[PDB]
Amino acid sequence: GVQVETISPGDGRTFPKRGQTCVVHYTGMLEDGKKFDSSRDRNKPFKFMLGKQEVIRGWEEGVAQMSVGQRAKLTISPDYAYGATGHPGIIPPHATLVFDVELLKLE
Protein backbone atom coordinates (compact mmCIF):
# COMPACT_ATOMS: atom_id res chain seq x y z
CA GLY A 1 0.00 0.00 0.00
CA VAL A 2 1.47 3.32 1.05
CA GLN A 3 4.04 4.32 3.64
CA VAL A 4 4.07 7.89 4.84
CA GLU A 5 7.31 9.29 6.22
CA THR A 6 7.18 12.84 7.49
CA ILE A 7 9.79 15.24 6.20
CA SER A 8 8.27 18.30 7.84
CA PRO A 9 5.36 18.37 10.40
CA GLY A 10 1.93 19.79 9.68
CA ASP A 11 -0.42 21.28 12.23
CA GLY A 12 -1.04 17.70 13.37
CA ARG A 13 -4.84 17.75 13.31
CA THR A 14 -6.35 19.03 10.06
CA PHE A 15 -6.71 15.93 7.92
CA PRO A 16 -8.58 16.06 4.61
CA LYS A 17 -12.09 14.59 4.64
CA ARG A 18 -14.04 13.03 1.77
CA GLY A 19 -15.41 15.76 -0.48
CA GLN A 20 -12.78 18.38 0.33
CA THR A 21 -10.31 19.62 -2.24
CA CYS A 22 -6.68 19.08 -1.39
CA VAL A 23 -4.14 21.55 -2.72
CA VAL A 24 -0.64 20.16 -2.78
CA HIS A 25 2.84 20.37 -4.23
CA TYR A 26 4.52 17.15 -5.30
CA THR A 27 7.37 15.50 -7.08
CA GLY A 28 7.09 11.93 -8.23
CA MET A 29 10.04 9.62 -8.78
CA LEU A 30 10.54 5.97 -9.61
CA GLU A 31 12.48 3.91 -7.08
CA ASP A 32 15.76 4.60 -8.89
CA GLY A 33 15.32 8.36 -8.43
CA LYS A 34 14.14 9.47 -11.86
CA LYS A 35 11.52 12.15 -11.62
CA PHE A 36 8.41 11.74 -13.77
CA ASP A 37 6.10 14.60 -12.69
CA SER A 38 6.30 17.68 -10.49
CA SER A 39 3.79 20.44 -9.82
CA ARG A 40 6.73 22.26 -8.26
CA ASP A 41 8.54 22.47 -11.59
CA ARG A 42 5.28 23.91 -12.93
CA ASN A 43 5.13 26.44 -10.07
CA LYS A 44 1.40 25.63 -9.82
CA PRO A 45 -0.16 23.63 -6.97
CA PHE A 46 -2.08 20.50 -7.87
CA LYS A 47 -5.71 20.09 -6.78
CA PHE A 48 -7.88 17.03 -6.32
CA MET A 49 -11.06 16.08 -4.52
CA LEU A 50 -10.57 13.33 -2.01
CA GLY A 51 -12.94 10.43 -2.56
CA LYS A 52 -13.69 10.86 -6.26
CA GLN A 53 -10.63 8.82 -7.25
CA GLU A 54 -9.09 11.54 -9.36
CA VAL A 55 -5.74 10.22 -8.12
CA ILE A 56 -4.21 6.79 -7.52
CA ARG A 57 -5.26 4.86 -4.43
CA GLY A 58 -1.93 5.31 -2.65
CA TRP A 59 -2.42 9.09 -2.89
CA GLU A 60 -6.04 9.15 -1.78
CA GLU A 61 -5.02 7.11 1.24
CA GLY A 62 -1.60 8.66 1.73
CA VAL A 63 -2.67 12.31 1.74
CA ALA A 64 -5.65 11.47 3.94
CA GLN A 65 -2.98 11.15 6.66
CA MET A 66 -0.92 14.40 6.33
CA SER A 67 -2.39 17.33 8.15
CA VAL A 68 -2.32 20.75 6.53
CA GLY A 69 1.23 22.04 6.23
CA GLN A 70 2.80 18.61 6.35
CA ARG A 71 5.45 17.47 3.88
CA ALA A 72 6.02 13.73 3.49
CA LYS A 73 7.40 10.93 1.37
CA LEU A 74 4.71 8.60 0.12
CA THR A 75 6.14 5.31 -1.10
CA ILE A 76 3.41 3.60 -3.08
CA SER A 77 3.39 -0.03 -4.20
CA PRO A 78 2.19 -0.95 -7.76
CA ASP A 79 -1.22 -2.25 -6.66
CA TYR A 80 -1.77 1.19 -5.09
CA ALA A 81 -0.37 3.07 -8.09
CA TYR A 82 -0.44 2.04 -11.75
CA GLY A 83 -0.26 -1.70 -11.31
CA ALA A 84 0.69 -4.07 -14.10
CA THR A 85 -0.24 -1.67 -16.87
CA GLY A 86 1.92 1.19 -15.64
CA HIS A 87 1.25 4.44 -17.53
CA PRO A 88 2.29 4.48 -21.25
CA GLY A 89 5.59 6.30 -21.64
CA ILE A 90 5.83 7.57 -18.06
CA ILE A 91 5.44 4.83 -15.48
CA PRO A 92 6.84 1.30 -15.98
CA PRO A 93 4.52 -1.61 -15.28
CA HIS A 94 4.76 -2.86 -11.64
CA ALA A 95 6.35 0.38 -10.53
CA THR A 96 6.77 1.48 -6.94
CA LEU A 97 6.39 5.24 -6.81
CA VAL A 98 7.95 7.67 -4.38
CA PHE A 99 6.28 11.07 -3.92
CA ASP A 100 7.41 14.16 -2.08
CA VAL A 101 4.08 15.69 -1.05
CA GLU A 102 3.08 18.86 0.76
CA LEU A 103 -0.54 19.51 1.67
CA LEU A 104 -0.76 23.28 1.28
CA LYS A 105 -4.43 23.68 2.19
CA LEU A 106 -8.00 22.37 1.92
CA GLU A 107 -11.00 23.96 0.20
Binding site: I56, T85, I90
Partner: protein, 326 residues
Protein backbone atom coordinates in the same frame (compact mmCIF):
# COMPACT_ATOMS: atom_id res chain seq x y z
CA UNK B 1 -8.83 29.48 -20.27
CA UNK B 2 -8.73 26.39 -22.51
CA UNK B 3 -7.38 22.91 -22.12
CA UNK B 4 -4.80 23.82 -24.78
CA UNK B 5 -3.65 26.86 -22.76
CA UNK B 6 -3.43 24.56 -19.79
CA UNK B 7 -1.32 22.06 -21.72
CA UNK B 8 0.99 24.92 -22.62
CA UNK B 9 1.31 26.38 -19.12
CA UNK B 10 2.09 23.03 -17.55
CA UNK B 11 4.73 22.25 -20.13
CA UNK B 12 8.21 21.60 -18.83
CA UNK B 13 11.32 20.26 -20.50
CA UNK B 14 10.48 16.59 -20.13
CA UNK B 15 6.72 16.79 -20.56
CA UNK B 16 4.83 14.95 -23.29
CA UNK B 17 2.27 16.21 -25.77
CA UNK B 18 -0.62 16.57 -23.33
CA UNK B 19 -1.10 17.20 -19.60
CA UNK B 20 1.25 16.05 -16.79
CA UNK B 21 0.73 12.52 -15.38
CA UNK B 22 -1.52 13.30 -12.40
CA UNK B 23 -3.43 16.07 -14.14
CA UNK B 24 -4.41 13.61 -16.81
CA UNK B 25 -6.51 11.59 -14.38
CA UNK B 26 -7.87 14.75 -12.79
CA UNK B 27 -9.29 15.84 -16.12
CA UNK B 28 -10.22 12.42 -17.46
CA UNK B 29 -12.34 11.74 -14.35
CA UNK B 30 -14.01 15.16 -14.47
CA UNK B 31 -15.16 14.82 -18.09
CA UNK B 32 -18.89 14.59 -18.74
CA UNK B 33 -19.70 12.27 -21.64
CA UNK B 34 -22.35 13.67 -24.00
CA UNK B 35 -22.96 11.51 -27.05
CA UNK B 36 -21.58 8.49 -28.81
CA UNK B 37 -20.00 9.81 -31.98
CA UNK B 38 -18.77 6.66 -33.66
CA UNK B 39 -18.44 2.96 -32.95
CA UNK B 40 -15.23 1.99 -34.77
CA UNK B 41 -13.42 -1.32 -34.96
CA UNK B 42 -11.41 -0.20 -31.92
CA UNK B 43 -14.00 1.03 -29.41
CA UNK B 44 -16.34 4.01 -29.20
CA UNK B 45 -15.61 7.71 -29.58
CA UNK B 46 -17.62 10.08 -27.43
CA UNK B 47 -18.07 13.80 -27.45
CA UNK B 48 -17.39 14.97 -23.94
CA UNK B 49 -17.21 18.21 -22.02
CA UNK B 50 -14.70 19.36 -19.42
CA UNK B 51 -15.83 22.41 -17.48
CA UNK B 52 -17.95 23.21 -20.51
CA UNK B 53 -15.20 22.77 -23.15
CA UNK B 54 -15.87 20.11 -25.81
CA UNK B 55 -13.41 17.27 -25.92
CA UNK B 56 -13.13 13.89 -27.62
CA UNK B 57 -12.94 10.65 -25.70
CA UNK B 58 -12.01 7.41 -27.37
CA UNK B 59 -12.92 4.48 -25.17
CA UNK B 60 -11.04 1.39 -26.28
CA UNK B 61 -12.24 -2.17 -25.73
CA UNK B 62 -10.15 -4.93 -24.08
CA UNK B 63 -8.64 -6.11 -27.39
CA UNK B 64 -6.97 -2.83 -28.31
CA UNK B 65 -5.39 -2.29 -24.92
CA UNK B 66 -2.24 -2.45 -27.07
CA UNK B 67 -3.44 0.24 -29.49
CA UNK B 68 -4.60 2.40 -26.57
CA UNK B 69 -1.21 1.86 -25.01
CA UNK B 70 0.87 2.62 -28.09
CA UNK B 71 -1.01 5.75 -29.11
CA UNK B 72 -0.73 7.16 -25.60
CA UNK B 73 2.87 5.98 -25.35
CA UNK B 74 3.77 7.85 -28.52
CA UNK B 75 2.09 11.12 -27.64
CA UNK B 76 3.82 10.87 -24.30
CA UNK B 77 7.38 10.09 -25.37
CA UNK B 78 7.31 12.15 -28.55
CA UNK B 79 6.55 15.86 -28.49
CA UNK B 80 3.65 16.10 -30.95
CA UNK B 81 1.92 19.47 -30.96
CA UNK B 82 1.17 20.48 -34.53
CA UNK B 83 -1.90 21.91 -36.22
CA UNK B 84 -2.02 18.91 -38.54
CA UNK B 85 -1.82 16.22 -35.89
CA UNK B 86 -4.78 15.39 -33.62
CA UNK B 87 -4.25 17.20 -30.32
CA UNK B 88 -3.63 14.81 -27.45
CA UNK B 89 -4.85 15.75 -23.97
CA UNK B 90 -4.74 12.78 -21.61
CA UNK B 91 -4.91 9.00 -21.35
CA UNK B 92 -6.61 7.19 -18.48
CA UNK B 93 -7.06 3.65 -17.20
CA UNK B 94 -10.33 3.61 -15.28
CA UNK B 95 -10.70 0.02 -14.14
CA UNK B 96 -13.76 -0.48 -11.91
CA UNK B 97 -14.01 -3.75 -9.95
CA UNK B 98 -16.63 -4.57 -12.60
CA UNK B 99 -14.88 -3.76 -15.94
CA UNK B 100 -11.68 -1.95 -16.99
CA UNK B 101 -12.13 1.04 -19.29
CA UNK B 102 -9.34 2.55 -21.44
CA UNK B 103 -9.64 6.28 -22.22
CA UNK B 104 -7.95 8.54 -24.74
CA UNK B 105 -8.83 12.23 -24.57
CA UNK B 106 -8.10 14.60 -27.44
CA UNK B 107 -9.37 17.68 -29.26
CA UNK B 108 -12.86 17.52 -30.72
CA UNK B 109 -13.55 18.08 -34.41
CA UNK B 110 -17.32 17.86 -35.41
CA UNK B 111 -16.72 16.92 -39.03
CA UNK B 112 -15.13 13.63 -38.07
CA UNK B 113 -12.86 11.69 -40.43
CA UNK B 114 -11.94 12.61 -43.99
CA UNK B 115 -13.87 9.45 -44.78
CA UNK B 116 -17.10 10.77 -43.21
CA UNK B 117 -16.47 14.17 -44.72
CA UNK B 118 -15.89 12.90 -48.28
CA UNK B 119 -18.96 10.72 -48.01
CA UNK B 120 -20.97 13.75 -46.99
CA UNK B 121 -19.44 16.38 -49.29
CA UNK B 122 -17.94 16.94 -52.69
CA UNK B 123 -15.08 19.32 -52.67
CA UNK B 124 -13.70 22.33 -54.50
CA UNK B 125 -10.30 22.48 -56.17
CA UNK B 126 -9.31 24.77 -53.34
CA UNK B 127 -10.90 22.44 -50.81
CA UNK B 128 -8.97 19.52 -52.29
CA UNK B 129 -5.69 21.33 -52.07
CA UNK B 130 -6.40 22.40 -48.48
CA UNK B 131 -7.18 18.78 -47.51
CA UNK B 132 -4.22 17.30 -49.33
CA UNK B 133 -1.75 20.00 -48.38
CA UNK B 134 -2.55 19.74 -44.70
CA UNK B 135 -2.48 15.93 -44.78
CA UNK B 136 1.02 16.02 -46.33
CA UNK B 137 2.14 18.59 -43.79
CA UNK B 138 0.96 16.47 -40.91
CA UNK B 139 2.62 13.38 -42.31
CA UNK B 140 5.77 15.27 -43.15
CA UNK B 141 5.81 16.52 -39.59
CA UNK B 142 5.52 12.99 -38.19
CA UNK B 143 8.25 11.61 -40.49
CA UNK B 144 10.63 14.39 -39.58
CA UNK B 145 13.31 14.24 -36.93
CA UNK B 146 13.56 17.67 -35.28
CA UNK B 147 16.64 18.44 -33.22
CA UNK B 148 16.54 20.24 -29.85
CA UNK B 149 14.63 20.43 -26.56
CA UNK B 150 11.30 21.06 -28.26
CA UNK B 151 12.60 18.35 -30.60
CA UNK B 152 11.11 15.08 -31.80
CA UNK B 153 12.19 11.72 -33.22
CA UNK B 154 10.89 10.56 -36.62
CA UNK B 155 7.64 8.57 -36.55
CA UNK B 156 5.94 6.31 -39.11
CA UNK B 157 2.19 6.02 -38.92
CA UNK B 158 1.54 2.54 -40.40
CA UNK B 159 -2.22 2.90 -40.71
CA UNK B 160 -2.88 6.02 -42.77
CA UNK B 161 -6.33 6.06 -44.33
CA UNK B 162 -9.40 8.30 -44.82
CA UNK B 163 -10.74 7.09 -41.52
CA UNK B 164 -7.65 8.19 -39.62
CA UNK B 165 -7.55 11.74 -40.77
CA UNK B 166 -9.86 14.26 -39.18
CA UNK B 167 -11.02 17.43 -40.84
CA UNK B 168 -11.33 20.60 -38.77
CA UNK B 169 -13.96 23.28 -39.26
CA UNK B 170 -11.51 25.39 -41.22
CA UNK B 171 -11.38 22.79 -44.02
CA UNK B 172 -7.98 21.49 -42.92
CA UNK B 173 -6.89 18.05 -41.76
CA UNK B 174 -4.96 16.53 -38.90
CA UNK B 175 -3.63 12.96 -38.70
CA UNK B 176 -5.01 10.77 -35.91
CA UNK B 177 -4.71 7.24 -34.44
CA UNK B 178 -1.05 6.64 -33.63
CA UNK B 179 -1.73 3.16 -32.18
CA UNK B 180 0.58 1.32 -34.61
CA UNK B 181 3.20 4.03 -35.00
CA UNK B 182 6.90 3.28 -34.85
CA UNK B 183 9.55 5.61 -33.54
CA UNK B 184 13.01 6.03 -34.97
CA UNK B 185 15.58 6.47 -32.26
CA UNK B 186 18.49 7.64 -34.37
CA UNK B 187 20.40 7.96 -31.11
CA UNK B 188 20.84 4.15 -31.29
CA UNK B 189 19.89 3.48 -34.90
CA UNK B 190 16.94 1.47 -33.60
CA UNK B 191 13.30 1.28 -34.57
CA UNK B 192 10.94 1.21 -31.63
CA UNK B 193 8.15 -1.11 -32.78
CA UNK B 194 5.35 -1.88 -30.34
CA UNK B 195 3.67 -5.35 -30.11
CA UNK B 196 0.05 -5.66 -31.26
CA UNK B 197 -2.18 -8.41 -32.72
CA UNK B 198 -3.29 -5.59 -35.03
CA UNK B 199 -1.64 -4.50 -38.29
CA UNK B 200 -2.52 -1.92 -40.95
CA UNK B 201 -5.86 -1.78 -42.75
CA UNK B 202 -5.36 -4.13 -45.69
CA UNK B 203 -6.57 -2.08 -48.63
CA UNK B 204 -4.05 0.64 -47.80
CA UNK B 205 -1.05 -1.64 -47.36
CA UNK B 206 1.93 -0.92 -49.58
CA UNK B 207 3.15 -3.63 -51.99
CA UNK B 208 6.25 -4.39 -49.86
CA UNK B 209 3.97 -4.93 -46.87
CA UNK B 210 1.51 -7.05 -48.76
CA UNK B 211 4.26 -9.37 -49.99
CA UNK B 212 6.30 -9.24 -46.76
CA UNK B 213 9.43 -8.00 -48.48
CA UNK B 214 9.58 -4.72 -46.52
CA UNK B 215 12.89 -4.46 -44.70
CA UNK B 216 11.81 -3.64 -41.16
CA UNK B 217 15.31 -2.78 -40.05
CA UNK B 218 15.30 0.41 -42.18
CA UNK B 219 13.15 3.28 -40.98
CA UNK B 220 12.82 4.72 -44.47
CA UNK B 221 10.84 1.63 -45.43
CA UNK B 222 8.08 2.69 -43.04
CA UNK B 223 7.88 6.24 -44.35
CA UNK B 224 7.71 4.93 -47.91
CA UNK B 225 4.85 2.66 -46.96
CA UNK B 226 2.97 5.68 -45.51
CA UNK B 227 3.51 7.60 -48.76
CA UNK B 228 1.87 4.86 -50.75
CA UNK B 229 -1.11 5.10 -48.44
CA UNK B 230 -1.20 8.90 -48.53
CA UNK B 231 -1.39 8.53 -52.30
CA UNK B 232 -4.50 6.41 -52.06
CA UNK B 233 -5.96 9.05 -49.76
CA UNK B 234 -5.26 11.73 -52.38
CA UNK B 235 -7.10 9.57 -54.85
CA UNK B 236 -10.13 9.40 -52.52
CA UNK B 237 -10.12 13.18 -52.25
CA UNK B 238 -9.59 13.99 -55.96
CA UNK B 239 -12.40 11.64 -56.82
CA UNK B 240 -14.65 14.10 -54.99
CA UNK B 241 -13.34 17.28 -56.51
CA UNK B 242 -16.45 18.69 -58.16
CA UNK B 243 -15.92 21.10 -61.03
CA UNK B 244 -19.05 22.38 -62.72
CA UNK B 245 -21.09 19.57 -61.21
CA UNK B 246 -18.89 16.66 -62.31
CA UNK B 247 -17.40 14.31 -59.76
CA UNK B 248 -17.53 10.70 -58.64
CA UNK B 249 -19.33 8.93 -55.81
CA UNK B 250 -17.17 8.40 -52.77
CA UNK B 251 -15.13 5.19 -52.93
CA UNK B 252 -12.36 3.49 -51.01
CA UNK B 253 -9.19 2.62 -53.00
CA UNK B 254 -9.58 -0.60 -55.01
CA UNK B 255 -13.33 -0.61 -54.40
CA UNK B 256 -13.80 -2.09 -57.90
CA UNK B 257 -11.07 -4.76 -57.87
CA UNK B 258 -11.63 -6.06 -54.38
CA UNK B 259 -14.30 -7.37 -51.97
CA UNK B 260 -15.23 -5.34 -48.95
CA UNK B 261 -12.95 -6.24 -46.04
CA UNK B 262 -10.12 -7.54 -48.33
CA UNK B 263 -7.69 -10.21 -47.14
CA UNK B 264 -3.94 -9.80 -47.51
CA UNK B 265 -4.03 -12.43 -50.25
CA UNK B 266 -6.74 -10.65 -52.29
CA UNK B 267 -4.97 -7.28 -52.04
CA UNK B 268 -1.71 -8.96 -52.95
CA UNK B 269 -3.11 -10.36 -56.19
CA UNK B 270 -4.32 -6.96 -57.35
CA UNK B 271 -1.41 -4.84 -56.16
CA UNK B 272 1.70 -7.05 -56.47
CA UNK B 273 0.88 -9.68 -59.08
CA UNK B 274 -1.44 -7.69 -61.32
CA UNK B 275 0.32 -4.45 -60.43
CA UNK B 276 -2.95 -2.49 -60.52
CA UNK B 277 -3.54 0.94 -58.95
CA UNK B 278 -6.73 2.93 -58.49
CA UNK B 279 -7.97 4.40 -61.77
CA UNK B 280 -6.87 7.93 -62.65
CA UNK B 281 -9.52 9.41 -65.02
CA UNK B 282 -8.16 10.93 -68.22
CA UNK B 283 -10.15 14.11 -67.53
CA UNK B 284 -7.86 14.93 -64.60
CA UNK B 285 -5.15 15.72 -67.12
CA UNK B 286 -6.95 18.85 -68.41
CA UNK B 287 -7.43 20.74 -65.14
CA UNK B 288 -3.99 21.60 -63.74
CA UNK B 289 -4.86 21.07 -60.06
CA UNK B 290 -6.01 17.48 -60.66
CA UNK B 291 -3.05 16.90 -62.96
CA UNK B 292 -0.64 17.73 -60.15
CA UNK B 293 -2.62 15.53 -57.76
CA UNK B 294 -2.63 12.70 -60.33
CA UNK B 295 1.09 13.06 -60.84
CA UNK B 296 1.60 12.90 -57.05
CA UNK B 297 -0.61 9.79 -56.83
CA UNK B 298 1.51 7.98 -59.44
CA UNK B 299 4.76 9.04 -57.69
CA UNK B 300 3.30 7.52 -54.55
CA UNK B 301 2.33 4.27 -56.19
CA UNK B 302 5.54 2.79 -57.58
CA UNK B 303 6.16 -0.79 -56.53
CA UNK B 304 9.68 0.34 -55.63
CA UNK B 305 9.45 2.21 -52.34
CA UNK B 306 12.68 4.11 -53.04
CA UNK B 307 11.26 5.83 -56.16
CA UNK B 308 8.29 7.26 -54.24
CA UNK B 309 7.99 10.90 -53.36
CA UNK B 310 8.78 12.11 -49.90
CA UNK B 311 6.08 13.61 -47.66
CA UNK B 312 8.08 16.85 -47.60
CA UNK B 313 8.29 16.97 -51.37
CA UNK B 314 4.56 16.44 -51.67
CA UNK B 315 4.17 19.23 -49.13
CA UNK B 316 6.30 21.44 -51.36
CA UNK B 317 4.84 20.75 -54.79
CA UNK B 318 1.44 21.14 -53.18
CA UNK B 319 2.50 24.51 -51.72
CA UNK B 320 3.63 25.75 -55.13
CA UNK B 321 0.27 24.64 -56.55
CA UNK B 322 -1.59 26.38 -53.74
CA UNK B 323 0.05 29.73 -54.53
CA UNK B 324 -0.68 29.52 -58.24
CA UNK B 325 -4.38 29.49 -57.41
CA UNK B 326 -4.67 31.88 -54.48
Amino acid sequence: TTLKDLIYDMTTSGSGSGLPLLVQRTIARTIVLQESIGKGRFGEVWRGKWRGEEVAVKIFSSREERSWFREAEIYQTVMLRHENILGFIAADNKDNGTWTQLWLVSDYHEHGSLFDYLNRYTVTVEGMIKLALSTASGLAHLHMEIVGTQGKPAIAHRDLKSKNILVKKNGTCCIADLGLAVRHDSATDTIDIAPNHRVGTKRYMAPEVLDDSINMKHFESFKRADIYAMGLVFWEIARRCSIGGIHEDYQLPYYDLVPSDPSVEEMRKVVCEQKLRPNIPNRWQSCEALRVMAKIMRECWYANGAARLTALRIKKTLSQLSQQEG
